[PDB]
Amino acid sequence: MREIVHIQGGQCGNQIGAKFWEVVSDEHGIDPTGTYHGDSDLQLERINVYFNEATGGRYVPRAILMDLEPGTMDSVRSGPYGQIFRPDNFVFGQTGAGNNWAKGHYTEGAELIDSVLDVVRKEAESCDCLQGFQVCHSLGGGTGSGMGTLLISKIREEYPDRMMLTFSVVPSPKVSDTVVEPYNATLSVHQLVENADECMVLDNEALYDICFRTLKLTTPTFGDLNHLISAVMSGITCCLRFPGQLNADLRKLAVNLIPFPRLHFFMVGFTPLTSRGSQQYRALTVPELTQQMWDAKNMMCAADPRHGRYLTASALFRGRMSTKEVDEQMLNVQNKNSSYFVEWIPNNVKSSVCDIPPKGLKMSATFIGNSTAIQEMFKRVSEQFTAMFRRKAFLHWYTGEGMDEMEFTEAESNMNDLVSEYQQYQDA
């Protein structure tokens, strides 16, 4: 019951999907062999949200790995937890994507799509009562942005009732891995507005600060950031997988969050995060968590919520704790700092809790908040786009794939009406 199915589109999607399944597999105590070697019966209770039984008591993930450039699907096949996926759920292409949204969305996408949809339905029927899909994108490249949204605009017509997430990694304002990056963003945003119910936005920058300020890490590797992303993705479905004195399915978390079908760009933050030095000075209490999560540092997206105004928010706690303390705390926030919250929403938080913490901790928490400072992101990408698009820089690459120029203006204006919805709704 409440079955999910997990997509992993692109190099990033195929590299952070490694970490996500290395977190869950540990949480349900299954060896890299796949066999279950946990302790309690609480693991085997709701394992079917993410896995499928196989002979001899072995659970394989219901994941879907799509990516061009098979040079990554040897890495996942050689990683420690790589021998658990089905060999069928590996849809690759011997051709590269070239960091080009067009060919990822027009030519090379278009032949892989059906070869992926043949897979997704082979595990959209394996479900008893499907909860919904979830994806891990990277809005810079061509595989995650071209084939990513193209896969979505197909999932939406065959399963519109269900609920699809988006853990989209967005481009960075100061860090620029590639040069064409603005184009692959806007043309992809124009797809998320119409075919996504929820979409958290993550940037490598806030991922770098939290890795340098809070975690005080000396060498933040990419395998370390994804330990943060994989920490929050597992933090959503704690209610789906474990009992809790106030459980919250994934659907009831969306309705309490997006007032209108378009403002589905969220902002996340995990707690607690502490160096191996301050583990000596810290106390494991609830006021410690709620102070750290409401901070403007855990915001894994590099937007400052003190510039906007929270429409709604959330909190998903884990660990046997007092259900009043978590309510009076969130009650104080709206009352002390009562300017960063809208007026036409009287109570704009939701609070859940689960009896089962992470494997190695005793208490944790997790944050989601739909702010209006998120428009600062869509402003930044809309300055660099209209800068180089004005002179048709790097345009012959996109139009060679059959694209045209209106495909840019539409995608641009569709960001302008969007960046004002967040503004008119933000009455200071």
Partner: protein
């Protein structure tokens, strides 16, 4: 095979018997048809 005997006799050499002649500066036959389109004219301004 050579020439018959007595036919390799020396001949008279005029002035400028062996002198190349510039045909003319003239438009060539084929411009070879460039494949790549030109650079835009810095004033298209398609963004709106």
């Amino acid at each position: 095979m050579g020439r018959p005997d007595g036919a390799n006799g020396p001949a008279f050499l005029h002035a400028h018997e062996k002198e190349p002649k510039l045909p003319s500066p003239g438009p060539p036959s084929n411009p070879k048809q460039k494949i790549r389109p030109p650079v835009p004219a810095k004033e298209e301004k398609p963004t709106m």
